[PDB]
């Protein structure tokens, strides 16, 4: 059975004082065991040392990005081997904001995933379609294309978690229903089964990366092919603890 | 008189063990006073806390990049206000590797410089032309266009240092002479005098960001319009100390 997975993407947010308050609140939380839910917290690069040194040892830390290949003359970038050196176990790759605002292509994302895995990182790999793409009836064409670019470069999926982001509902005034989330997760898992292997489809966590909050987390998490969440803004808030506790619905 | 300035850009390099060795070596160095030379060291984001906590207090730390505007939903990016919060005083912006590989436009760089200054950072702003551009006779056309994009957005130059990168000599098999460096620095300073102000031209450090090592630092540093260096690979090596010591040539 797939272990429920809850990741918290802090995005480009944080100060030393706020990080201290967030971590203290997480440290005082009483949540399901590590056998029931896998919890990953992702601060900006410059707060990885502070968070890794002060966060409860049963929660894990992720970087929000890394470079596509070995380090060297790439001013401003952080290599996967640096993260491994600092004992940062996870990385988020292919987030919708990086695909859209920083123009990361599906192929670029796939090369990053492959390189990160080869260095020993575990990866939250993000996919998702825009409002224009959904309206065009292209949701699964887009999500499959993004996933295929990764699948073409990755032979071993053990340390991958896929995050589906309904970008079409992100600040579009559209809201995503639990039924809509389940439809995409189900079709994506079917795609993995048909295009990678039955074993990979059965064992790979596919987590929901749309709007998740204390109010809707149990309803989303109870969906058959939803294995957890990649949380945005709520991950900065005490409400993240309630989202972790949604693992009990499984 | 303009204070000599030596920045060390570590680029995408470093491990905890190597950082400890580099910092120990700098900490044991005996170099000209803080009144004679201003020294800035720039590690990858994830080593900014380690370096800030262990480096001698009379040397300063820089980030290698920051985001173009206020933080928020920009997964993977580090905002200028984060760096200020962590007491990181400097940032490198517009480095040739980010212009070329990550496609940062001159306008994007200009906006970053303005935002960083607005938040209280000091900025090393990088400009420079390619081999194709130099061979076409466009060196000063290009450097002026890049500088204009920054100047059009900057209201106060006190906390700006300009770095000229002879990109045309970077892995092209061409070598830049000290005379060639001095020509560009002189023409760039004259451009500042005519198009910003005589005071800004007289007071703004323009540092050389081509190949600098122990062997050539004195000849370069002695040029009338060269105010120091943005060092690449030598910045990881004990030789960085000899480059700092070139300040004595002024």
Residue numbers in the entry:
A (entry chain B), B (entry chain A): 2 to 251
Sentences copied from the publication:
Triosephosphate isomerase (TPI) interconverts glyceraldehyde 3-phosphate (G3P) and dihydroxyacetone phosphate (DHAP). One or various cytoplasmic and chloroplast TPIs (cTPI and pdTPI), are present in plant genomes. cTPIs are involved in glycolysis, whereas chloroplast enzymes participate in the Calvin-Benson cycle. In conclusion, our data indicate that the duplicated TPI gene from A. thaliana has suffered two evolutionary fates: the cTPI isoform is susceptible to redox agents, whereas the pdTPI isoform is resistant.
Crystal structures of cTPI and pdTPI were solved at 1.7 and 2.15 Å respectively. Residue cTPI-C13 presents an ASA of 2.6 and 2.8 Å2 for monomers A and B respectively, whereas residue C218 presents an ASA of 6.7 and 2.6 Å2 for monomers A and B respectively. DTNB conjugation indicates that cTPI presents 2 accessible cysteines suggesting that both cTPI-C218 and cTPI-C13 are possible targets of redox agents. We found that the addition of 1 mM of DA inhibited cTPI activity to less than 5% of the untreated level, a response also observed in yeast TPI. At a GSSG concentration of 0.87 mM, using cTPI at 0.184 μM (10 μg/ml), enzymatic activity decreased to ~70% with respect to the activity of the untreated cTPI and was completely inhibited at concentrations above 6.5 mM. From these loop 3 residues, the only interaction that is different between AtTPIs, is that in cTPI residue M83 makes a hydrophobic interaction with cTPI-C13, whereas in pdTPI residue Q83 makes a H-bond with pdTPI-C15. Residue cTPI-C218 is the most exposed cysteine in cTPI, in contrast pdTPI presents a serine at this position (pdTPI-S218). cTPI-C218 and pdTPI-S218 are surrounded by charged amino acids. However, cTPI-C218 is located before a lysine, whereas pdTPI-S218 is positioned before an alanine indicating that the epsilon amino group of cTPI-K219 may contribute to the reactivity of cTPI-C218.
